[PDB]
Design a binder for this molecule. Structure first.
Ligand code: 9O9
Ligand code: 9O9
Ligand code: 9O9
Ligand code: 9O9
Ligand code: PPY
Ligand code: PPY
Ligand code: PPY
Ligand code: PPY
Ligand code: MG
Ligand code: MG
Ligand code: MG
Ligand code: MG
Lengths: 332, 332, 332, 332
């Protein structure tokens, strides 16, 4: 594999069509799914030259701990759909690569099993109808050693997945929600923040004033995201709001972004627009589908090489230097 | 049907080619027909998160009465071209869905028959050569219980419909103007406004100063519209003028928009740009062609679900909240 | 024929490929040829409604005389390439339509023969190496009753016509320059202006300061033009400079535009951007090729209908009103 | 050959696929390779008319000596890949055309042999791990009569050439680095500047502040360049930074540009955006592949004719006049 696109081709070959569609699809007309890629392709970096690259490092510190790359594995539900080892294969490879892994509320292996793999597990929360049950799930994650609560805030309900409707897609009997819903509000965020000392990261923020309110609410971070184009069809790409959100946040929390990251150059673009780190979703599942744990390892090694390559070519010895790069929008 | 595009495919299958072309076509090179869709596809919404969605409602009040959605059926002439029940099938489904139905001056069933279906009938006026006859038509509509006069102001004459010319299209002998023309001016508007206590809504306004003059003239509303691309070829899309017109009108009348609405997300976009409500034309006829009254019912149920979905995903419990959403233009 | 594009198809059928290429082609990569069309397609008009259209007229006054439309036939050399009657067929149809006809320096029928057709003949000048010969040609045109001298200023030499080079195209022995070259300068303009009381119109101006200098030099008009994409490849379209040039000229001369006019709507766009009138080149030759004099008559009747249609749909009873229309750029 | 694109077709016919790919390819997704062409195609020139063209000249003075065109042959490694005479064929043709030739550090014929051809040889430096060896290479070039040191500053290492990886491309045994690496820094630039009285030209500058620092560092020139899209994938095109860099440099050094020059019109565009001169890479190798020395001669004669044509059509008797042209961005 010499690009993440190689892995997409390999996963399309192996997966059943309706499972590939569950993974690849977005909501509605897929306008936001496509725009996530359009937006990154319009960004060009202005690289710097002639800087010291003696000790180029892609490492970052986030939520108190070192990560090997400015990247984490996005929460993607039901990973046993893609490979029999599911979440355990992905979490093992992430651990070995030094990348945080976000455990899903709708994981097909229990959160305690996945946390026992080790590494840096985060936990993605969906709000349950029942504050008490929601908080018990947060407490389970904390007791199991997860380091952050990634509270998904853009799913009052699931978007309209027209591929799934047309395919009549349903979970196989052999895939279940191994950890076993209502719209979340700012009151739900406060209940979580009061229940845990872990950093609470709000995933799915796109409006500048919601990013400011997230800091005011005590969030340790946000993920600027349109949920990979799977929720509101026509939601702006996170990448297009990132710069304005980073300016409004004034360092008050970590600002991550996701949606459409398909290379180390895309990581560099996100960093140059001000992201602390990115999440990567579909490509990790492609690698899982194509070759299990070893596939995910290869993907993360390829992404690490691409990130190091892009940083050094752009004159950046550290991720902080990359955040100080300027960019210019082009036409594609 | 899981999208309005499903219905377009179904109507193309059933209708004779020249009737599909009469419905689908625009004037000239169809630049404005295409631009109506281009414009909506360039708009992206910035959704809000974590708001109370306990009681999401798509209802609005307009011209004194409640409507179930921020939408009405646009005036489309000669609906018996598309289905034997024509206007009665559409008006029955609109009534049952809680959506106003605009009766045409060139309806193929008389306006009194269509008004007798019930619901919320509006009446679309074309100016007749003869003030007295024009006003008698307004009086008929009022006597029959129509709630608003939608005065079409962008047809001094019909545009150049090159599909119709190339097809040699003419009305079948079995379709007639069952209610049975000169360019309208501001004097014509004043004559209508003085003749009726119903709100007069000027349909086909695109210039900001014409929107201001409409308020000064006593209009209760305007429809920002290029007539679905069927009149001036190269007229700007209504959606591209809507924000500037809403700012200039300062709440002085209702501001509707039409042209290219093909989903509940498109309704959300129009609302976010400031529209009070939208009109929907061609998709309603697709549903009529495909399956008569039941087809139109299914279309309106699908649109209601899409509007509720898009509003809630965007953090909006009411249409007023949706009007306060911000937007960002993209590239497609 | 219901559009000018119908005539293009008819002319491609009848003409020999290398003559169609001589007519259709531009210089170099044809970037400016394509951009002339791209530019018009990006312009959208903001029409006005509810204005008095009792007496819509497409007439203009230019260089002291009435024309039936805001249009003249552009200078196109060697019209016998396209039809045996060549320039006489075109000039007869232009006369009958009330449209000025620009006689070429490189006409395949003598300028005195073409002027004898009547109508409103203008004369397009190329500067000869020899001031005295150039001025004698101007004097011939004046003696023959031409009403304006259209001095082409964008041909210090012919551009690189790669279609012609690849085709090995040369004039047939039966086509000659029936009136029988050096780069023109501002001194050449002054020599012409001093030699004739006819208005001198500089054709091929694109820079704002050249338009200002043209007024200072005593020009009666300019044609904002990149020579139909046939001279500098990569020259900006005239339509993209027109508004800035009209503002800089402050009414000091007539400002015409050409390049890519393919409909009455395009005429309206040019007028709305501030042009006094347009020139039309290739479409007139298409009509000549397809059907001789009668073809050109049909073209001009079609253009007259399209111009009247577009003006009235846009609320304009006169060309002056059309010049006061606003426009908005779109994406196509 | 009537365009540079003719030569590209001829070279694709003759070269082995993997050598054509080595020549044509870029890094990563080739976003910057494509954008180099997109950027030039978006630029339109505003030509001037009616200026004296008695003595049009394409000559420039650069680094103290006259060149026949505002162009030099870019450094392209291993030219024996394309033709058995390699660098000697290209340098002979460049000499005969009056164009400087940049000798590569990775030339397949020794720099002393190529300099002995005569003409105006420049020398492109890659920094060696070893200041002393780097400076000895600079001294060899100077001793052999090279006139400028073109220090490539955008290669801390080679970019990711996915065509080469997929092809398994390697140098044939019969091609070697006949002159026989570490990241360069500003200290490396100072070591070169102190070692030679030749002008030092930094190639691969894209950031405005790096251009300013280059002047402060004593560079005699810079090449605004993304290395033909072969280094950072997603680096901005040089052409898009050129105007801002020329303004920041305030005449303090020569400002060249490269990437995607495919015609004399493209040379004119670069000049109008403020470049002192351009470099041309791939087209020179196409000509070498297609027909050896004579091919390169034909290419340079064609480019000279296109540059003279474009300059005169744009009203420019000198390259300095062309630099004073204005431009307008379009859509393509
Ligand atoms: C099949 C699939 C399931 C989920 C389930 C979840 C989820 O239960 N909770 C959550 O909070 N986000 C999810 N997501 C979004 C994900 O976390 C990233 O937001 C996007 O995948 C980023 O875009 P890509 O890198 O995929 O372009 C999903 C994405 C995909 C493709
Ligand atoms: C076949 C057809 C006939 C009519 C006849 C009329 C009419 O006698 N009076 C009027 O005032 N508007 C009309 N219209 C325009 C309509 O009311 C809406 O302006 C557009 O259909 C909105 O765009 P879509 O939703 O169709 O894109 C028509 C639209 C179509 C397609
Ligand atoms: C075959 C052909 C010959 C000539 C010869 C001349 C000419 O001897 N003198 C002149 O001054 N302009 C010319 N022109 C340009 C013309 O006058 C108009 O500038 C463009 O045709 C406007 O663009 P279209 O309407 O064609 O798009 C020509 C255009 C075409 C196509
Ligand atoms: C096969 C190939 C090898 C080299 C090797 C070098 C090099 O050892 N040192 C250097 O400093 N630049 C190089 N370059 C870049 C070149 O000098 C110009 O920057 C681009 O070719 C300009 O773009 P095009 O004119 O090609 O679009 C190369 C370009 C090509 C195509
Ligand atoms: O991504 C999916 O569809 C899932 O299976 C989990 C889920 C469910 C509803 C909304 C978002 C994610
Ligand atoms: O839409 C049409 O073509 C109609 O049948 C009614 C009509 C007629 C003329 C202009 C606008 C609408
Ligand atoms: O258009 C042409 O090519 C002609 O035949 C006349 C001409 C010649 C040179 C430049 C412009 C027009
Ligand atoms: O262009 C190439 O790939 C070369 O052969 C020389 C080279 C090597 C590494 C970076 C830039 C140029
Ligand atoms: Mg991503
Ligand atoms: Mg609509
Ligand atoms: Mg024209
Ligand atoms: Mg180049």
């Amino acid at each position: 594999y010499v690009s993440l696109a190689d892995l997409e081709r390999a996963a399309r070959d192996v997966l059943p069509g309706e499972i590939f569609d569950f993974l690849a699809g977005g909501s509605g007309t897929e306008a936001s799914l496509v725009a996530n890629r359009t937006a990154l392709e319009r960004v060009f970096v202005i690289p710097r030259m002639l800087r010291d690259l003696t000790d180029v490092t892609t490492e970052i510190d986030i939520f108190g701990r070192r990560a090997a790359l400015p990247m984490a594995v996005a929460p993607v539900a039901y990973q046993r759909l893609f490979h029999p080892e599911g979440e355990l294969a992905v979490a093992r490879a992430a651990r070995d690569a030094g990348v945080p892994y976000t455990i899903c509320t709708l994981s097909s292996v229990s959160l305690e099993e996945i946390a026992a793999v080790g590494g840096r597990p985060w936990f993605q929360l969906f709000w349950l109808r029942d504050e008490k049950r929601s908080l018990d799930l947060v407490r389970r994650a904390e007791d199991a050693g997860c380091e952050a609560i990634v509270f998904t805030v853009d799913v009052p309900w699931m978007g309209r997945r027209l591929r799934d409707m047309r395919n009549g897609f349903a979970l196989p009997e052999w895939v279940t929600a191994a950890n076993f819903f209502a719209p979340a509000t700012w009151e739900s965020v406060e209940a979580v923040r009061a229940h845990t000392d872990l950093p609470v990261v709000l995933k799915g923020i796109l409006a500048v004033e919601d990013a400011r309110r997230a800091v005011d609410a005590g969030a340790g971070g946000i993920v600027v995201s349109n949920h990979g184009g799977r929720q509101l069809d026509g939601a702006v790409p996170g990448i297009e709001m990132l710069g304005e959100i980073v300016a409004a946040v004034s360092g008050g929390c970590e600002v991550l972004v996701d949606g459409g990251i398909r290379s180390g150059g895309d990581v560099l673009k996100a960093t140059a627009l001000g992201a602390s780190a990115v999440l990567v979703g579909r490509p990790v599942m492609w690698a899982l589908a194509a070759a299990g744990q070893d596939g995910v390892r290869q993907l993360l090694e390829l992404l690490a090489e691409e990130v190091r390559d892009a940083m050094g070519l752009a004159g950046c010895e550290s991720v902080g230097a990359a955040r100080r790069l300027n960019t210019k929008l082009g036409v594609v």
